[PDB]
Design a protein around this ligand. Sequence first.
Ligand code: PQQ
Ligand code: CA
Length: 409
Amino acid sequence: FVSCPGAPQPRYQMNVANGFRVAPVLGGLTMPRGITLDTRGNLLVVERGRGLTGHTLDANGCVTSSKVVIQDTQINHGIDVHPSGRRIIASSGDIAWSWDYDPATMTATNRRTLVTGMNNFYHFTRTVHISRKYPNLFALNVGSDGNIDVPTRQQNSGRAQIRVFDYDQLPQNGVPFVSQYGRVLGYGLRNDVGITEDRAGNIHSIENSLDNAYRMVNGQRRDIHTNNPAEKVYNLGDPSNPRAIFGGYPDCYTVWEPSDFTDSPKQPGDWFTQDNSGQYTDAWCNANAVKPTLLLPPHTAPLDMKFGLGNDTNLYVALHGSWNRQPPQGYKVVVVPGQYSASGEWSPTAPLAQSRTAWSDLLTNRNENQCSGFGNANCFRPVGLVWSADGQNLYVSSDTSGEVFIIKR
Ligand SMILES: O=C(O)c1cc(C(=O)O)c2c(n1)C(=O)C(=O)c1cc(C(=O)O)[nH]c1-2
Ligand SMILES: [Ca+2]
């Protein structure tokens, strides 16, 4: 395999790990965000500002034709296909809807309003994940309204949190996100755009953390943003038994670089607060917040993740790349090694405190540190991931470059 028939050349230099090949399958798309595959293996793409587009595939996984499945200017990221293959769910910043779906023709009909009132202008993606273990259940993310959204201390803020809804219980015209139907799976989660599940049905989420981090040291503001805080994954567990896991936000953040913490020694994965005073101190975080399972580098901006299939026991993560770091970093797909229990529960191989070095590059730009976005510096910016059912092809969207790629074993 070298390339897909009729597909455009990649816009940018793309390097891949040993044993893989990469090629574009789609170009010139309008802000392609979330992607998935239906039950007949067709590719579905949210083209933010256009709608859901549907793409038939050949035996190599190349795209042969495209059509508009949902003509809608408001759906802006989230998309999933029910395990039955006969329903899809997609969202704007404000509302999640379902449609009846027929994979034979990639046709969406009979729109139904599910969940309402979610809009904010700061973090406006509403990631959708339908539980594969419990197919009547679906999760929705609502990120914070602001870098440090203090009201998110309360669950009933309806922000920086993921709720699980039972489709079969929803009134016909839908429900507010903050309602008894939206059961809090995790809160204190700044912006958890990437959501997936392991083979046991546990929900794992991945977080975009704090911008412009500082640490108060003897009353002076130390700028620690270059290498703090960590991006991170949470294991939110069984979505049929939601328990409102507290992830720490808006007060507690996760150490990436310990050398930024001179007042008292820290390890990667430890909690810190910006001020370390009043009620919400470092010690308070230790006693009250649930730790993530693994770390990824500051500002890398994970937007999706997917587990490998079959005998591939890795987690794959799309890192959109930073704006709040000099030099920039991310702009890649990475691999995190792990293992499964007998029941299919995934865990990373590295202990949390050793996880800074545990990931590795799968798909990269020429040099992530060269990706400023001014002049000729431009890079592909991974957003969405999906594996083919045979585990041989991994699709990757890049919103700002208008591309979808296939990574082939
Ligand atoms: O720290 C950063 O440099 C940085 C970069 C990006 C990015 O440009 O994608 C995001 C974030 N942070 C972030 O915190 C966040 O919630 C976020 C959401 C998105 C998105 O594309 O949906 N990008 C980013
Ligand atoms: Ca950030």
